Design a binder for this molecule. Structure first.
Ligand code: JU4
Ligand SMILES: *[C@@H]1O[C@H](CO[C@@H]2O[C@@H](C)[C@@H](O)[C@@H](O)[C@@H]2O)[C@@H](O[C@@H]2O[C@H](CO)[C@@H](O)[C@H](O)[C@H]2NC(C)=O)[C@H](O)[C@H]1NC(C)=O
Ligand SMILES: *[C@@H]1O[C@H](CO)[C@@H](O[C@@H]2O[C@H](CO)[C@@H](O)[C@H](O)[C@H]2NC(C)=O)[C@H](O)[C@H]1NC(C)=O
Ligand code: NAG
Ligand code: NA
Ligand code: NA
Ligand code: NA
Ligand code: NA
Ligand code: NA
Ligand code: NA
Ligand code: NA
Ligand code: NA
Ligand code: NA
Lengths: 273, 97, 201, 239
């Protein structure tokens, strides 16, 4: 299952100044970028056009170009409309796309955040506020829902265009999406908060895809004190992760870090301290 | 929300061997931010930035990276200025961490 | 210069003839296009609104087309009547909501020349309601072929021709008025009037 | 969804204060002020999304907007200039795209009011010759000696306005075309059947509404203050 996400970030500093920047993800791989200073959407993969013809892509891009300008003015007008309830500066984020399931099934979404809080979605045939949203948004929703043309366009984009486009992306991008990159590991140590304690660190870098197993071990005994950090990105669309273990000074000898990853083909990495 | 900063190398660090240093800045808003990567407290030129994006929880993140050659003597850091902080926050690269 | 351009600027047609008015625009996006009729010194009357990519509408003798790809609309008037004399204005709305701005064309001026079936050109003298001495000269019931010239004499006043419509009788007539402080025989000498113009006495 | 404007016609002097008012009882949040000038489409001056809201349009300079209530939206010319001579339209609407337009207000800003003069109005009765020749009867109304040219001429039979059989000159003519501030004349015709004119129960009146000075305008000349007023002339039908 792959989630396609179009992420829009719009800053409105005051009545005059604004910028909108977008990035597009298929799973954890970036497929598009659209900078405020660019007239056109940028491909970040050879296969970012999917299976769309040039005419189909140009038409789709045109729709987005009209959208970006129209969106900017509409926010500025909505601020005037709700004045002086809401004032600049204002951040608006959109998360839109579709989740792809087997048997050509899919679910589409369009979520909107105002000042970093999820307040609005498109659902069915209309815009709606979500639980917890402030009541003043009811007027913007009324105004947005008066626009039958936008409603019809969004319905088509979410229901039809998104899944069709993404099906083609998955085909065109197969070899990148299914790439295997091997982890490399290395060990290190630092003093912890405790007085006479050490903190061993197993560094694991360069692996793709994300799923990985990393455990400190004394022989066949998995050390339960093992603490995985967060998954951190490398610049080359691989992943980095470190697993720590708080131990007593002197007890380092005997410990080893074992790494299991799909890319290694059963040949686990074992590093002895 | 106040930016978290994580500094890590792409490859196992070895003194005198070229490498890449990453600075990953997360969980901040609003998205306006200044990120500098430092060698011995001095701004490294030609630092590359990923496109800014945001997570499930709507908080922003971005990855800075630069070529670097670790040595015994040279220090490396990532310095972040954000409206959520009175002073810039600096996180030093520690190969052992 | 502007985002909405209309053509022709102006035209003159005879009663019963059809005509076509053009609107071309550069407005983006184009949610809908409306045609207004504006009578002289009066307000805006909506004739039709076009919304579809390739739209066609009708409203009695009015019909309209919209091609959003070419950004072009036409208004057709079938079998023009005197009352079609007006300015016709094209408006493009850039949103399907109140967030929209309207983009107005500068209009096309249409004049319809009425068809005078049974002319009876004549010059009559009319006397003032109060003072017996005051009078005007009324040149009436001439067809639209006839043209009324301004006076050579600076102290003789002559109006342009003017058509009235007696609706209950289905009767229209042209007229012009002349006065001074001068006889009605002399009043319209500077105009070429029909040979068989009736001068009573 | 109706919208009204007041005044419908106004003559003002440069440097004076003019307020154009728009009222709608549609409970519409949104109201809009435009001006229409020859050679141009309507142009947006100011608009409002509700009581207390005023927003600048495309050509706001020289105008202030005021939205004291949901019902009323005013356009204020603090220091009127001749460039503001125009026809002004107000519109309202709800969240939908439709704007419902008012009937328009005609504003003339003069440099000076010294030449402002109301009309004399005369009614000329139908020719016996026309009646015998056509079995029709044309009345002529003449408004003379007025300045400026902001007049509305209407016909009334037995106290009700008539439009059928009427035609009024499209614009007044100048009485002294050589002179700068020439006075104007305007004529109108009302044509009825001979039997209608011949009925002595029929009372005919030509009315000219003249737009001139207000009560508050200063007047330094000796002649009567040429205020906004109706001038009319009348006659009864007769055999
Ligand atoms: C999402 C799936 C995408 C899959 C495919 C693309 C993948 C490739 C990569 C894409 C990269 C681009 C990334 C972009 C970031 C993601 C953005 C997702 C949001 C998509 C929303 C698209 C909306 C498109 C429509 C639009 O531009 N509306 C524009 C323009 O609309 C006008 O022109 C339109 C031309 O088509 C129609 O007129 C013509 C018309 C007339 C009649 C008919 Cl019947 C029809 Cl069909 C068409 C319209 O009727 C007309 O009004 C309109 O201004 C919208 O209001 C714009 C904003 C919409 C989003 C609002 C979000 C909620 C904000 C809440 C704010 C509250 C804050 C208050 C202070
Ligand atoms: C598009 O599909 C929707 C229903 O799908 C949901 O909303 C979409 C925007 C997308 O997020 C999907 O993944 C969701 O599952 C249709 O909405 C229904 O429309 C009918 C009337 O047309 C109405 O009776 C239903 O209540 C709507 N459903 C809901 C849940 O509100 C919509 O009609 C589809 N439009 C087109 C043009 O195909
Ligand atoms: C983001 O992009 C928009 C669209 O190009 C910029 O808006 C333009 O700004 C220039 C002046 O810098 C104006 O001449 C244009 O008329 C604007 N375009 C539109 C469509 O209105 C905007 O300035 C950019 N933002 C930043 C901060 O650079
Ligand atoms: C609007 O905000 C921008 C960006 O913060 C700033 O540079 C500018 O001074 C502001 N403009 C005005 C007119 O206040
Ligand atoms: Na619409
Ligand atoms: Na024609
Ligand atoms: Na209509
Ligand atoms: Na609509
Ligand atoms: Na607007
Ligand atoms: Na125009
Ligand atoms: Na006579
Ligand atoms: Na005031
Ligand atoms: Na409106």
């Amino acid at each position: 299952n792959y989630t396609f996400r179009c992420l829009q970030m719009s800053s409105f500093a005051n009545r005059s100044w604004s910028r909108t920047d977008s990035v597009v993800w298929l799973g954890d791989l970036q497929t598009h970028r659209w900078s405020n200073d660019s007239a056109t959407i940028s491909f970040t993969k050879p296969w970012s056009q999917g299976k769309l013809s040039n005419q189909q892509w140009e038409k789709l891009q045109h729709m987005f170009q009209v959208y970006r300008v129209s969106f900017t003015r509409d926010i500025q007008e909505l601020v005037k409309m709700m004045s002086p309830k809401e004032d600049y500066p204002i951040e608006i984020q959109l998360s839109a796309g579709c989740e792809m399931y087997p048997g050509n099934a899919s679910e589409s979404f369009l979520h909107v955040a105002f000042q970093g809080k999820y307040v609005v979605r498109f659902w069915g045939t209309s815009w709606q506020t979500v639980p917890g949203a402030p009541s003043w948004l009811d007027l913007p929703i009324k105004v947005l829902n008066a626009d039958q043309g936008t409603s019809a366009t969004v319905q088509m984009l979410l229901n039809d265009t998104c899944p069709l486009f993404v099906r083609g992306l998955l085909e065109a991008g197969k070899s990148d999406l299914e790439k295997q990159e091997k982890p490399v590991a290395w060990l290190s140590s630092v003093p912890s908060s405790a007085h006479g304690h050490r903190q061993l660190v197993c560094h694991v870098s360069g692996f793709y895809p994300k799923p990985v197993w990393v455990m400190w071990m004394r022989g066949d005994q998995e050390q339960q004190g093992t603490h995985r950090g967060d998954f951190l990105p490398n610049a080359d669309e691989t992943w980095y992760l470190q697993a720590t273990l708080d131990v007593e000074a002197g007890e380092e000898a005997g410990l080893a870090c074992r790494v299991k990853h799909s890319s290694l083909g059963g040949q686990d990495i074992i590093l002895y301290w | 929300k106040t930016p978290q900063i994580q500094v890590y190398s792409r490859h196992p660090p070895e003194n005198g061997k070229p490498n890449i240093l990453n600075c990953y800045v997360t969980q901040f808003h609003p998205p306006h931010i200044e990120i500098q990567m430092l060698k011995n407290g001095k701004k490294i030129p030609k630092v590359e930035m990923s496109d800014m994006s945001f997570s499930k929880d709507w908080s922003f993140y971005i990855l800075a990276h630069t070529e670097f050659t670790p040595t015994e003597t040279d220090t490396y850091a990532c310095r972040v200025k954000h409206a959520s902080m009175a002073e810039p926050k600096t996180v030093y690269w520690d190969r052992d961490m | 210069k502007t985002q909405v351009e209309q053509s022709p600027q102006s035209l003159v047609v005879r009663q019963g003839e059809n005509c076509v008015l053009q609107c071309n625009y550069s407005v983006t996006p184009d949610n809908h296009l409306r045609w207004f009729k504006q009578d002289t010194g009066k307000g805006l009357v909506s004739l039709t609104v076009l919304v579809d990519q390739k739209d066609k509408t009708s409203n009695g003798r009015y019909s309209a087309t919209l091609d959003k790809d070419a950004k072009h609309s036409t208004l057709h008037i079938t079998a023009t009547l005197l009352d079609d004399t007006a300015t016709y204005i094209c408006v493009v709305g850039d949103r399907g909501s109140a967030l929209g701005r309207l983009h107005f064309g500068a209009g096309t001026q249409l004049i319809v020349i009425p068809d005078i079936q049974n002319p009876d050109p004549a010059v009559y003298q009319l006397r003032d309601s109060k003072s017996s001495d005051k009078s005007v000269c009324l040149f009436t019931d001439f067809d639209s072929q006839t043209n009324v010239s301004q006076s050579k004499d600076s102290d003789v006043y002559i109006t342009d021709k003017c058509v009235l419509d007696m609706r209950s009788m289905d009767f229209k007539s042209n007229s012009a008025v002349a006065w001074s402080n001068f006889a009605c025989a002399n009043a319209f000498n500077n105009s070429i009037i029909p040979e068989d113009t009736f001068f009573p006495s | 969804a109706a919208v009204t404007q007041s005044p419908r016609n106004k003559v003002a002097v440069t440097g004076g204060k003019v307020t154009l008012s728009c009222n709608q009882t549609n409970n519409h949040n949104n109201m809009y002020w435009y001006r229409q000038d020859t050679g141009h489409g309507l142009r947006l001056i100011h608009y409002s999304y509700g009581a207390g809201s005023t927003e600048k349009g495309d050509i706001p300079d020289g105008y202030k907007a005021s939205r004291p209530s949901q019902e009323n939206f005013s356009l204020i010319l603090e220091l009127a200039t001749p460039s503001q001579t125009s026809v002004y339209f107000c519109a309202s609407g709800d969240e939908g795209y439709t704007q419902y337009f008012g009937p328009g207000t005609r504003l003339l800003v003069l440099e000076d009011l010294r030449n402002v003069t109301p009309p004399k109005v005369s009614l000329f009765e139908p020719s016996k010759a026309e009646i015998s020749h056509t079995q029709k009867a044309t009345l002529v109304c003449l408004a003379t000696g007025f300045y400026p040219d902001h007049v509305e001429l209407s016909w009334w039979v037995n106290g009700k306005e008539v439009h059928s059989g009427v035609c009024t000159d499209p614009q007044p003519l100048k009485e002294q075309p050589a002179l700068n501030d020439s006075r104007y004349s305007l004529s109108s015709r009302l044509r009825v059947s001979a039997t209608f004119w011949q009925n002595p129960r029929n009372h005919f009146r030509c009315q000219v509404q003249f737009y001139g000075l207000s009560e508050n305008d200063e007047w330094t000349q000796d002649r009567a203050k040429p205020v906004t007023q109706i001038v009319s002339a009348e006659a009864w039908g007769r055999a």
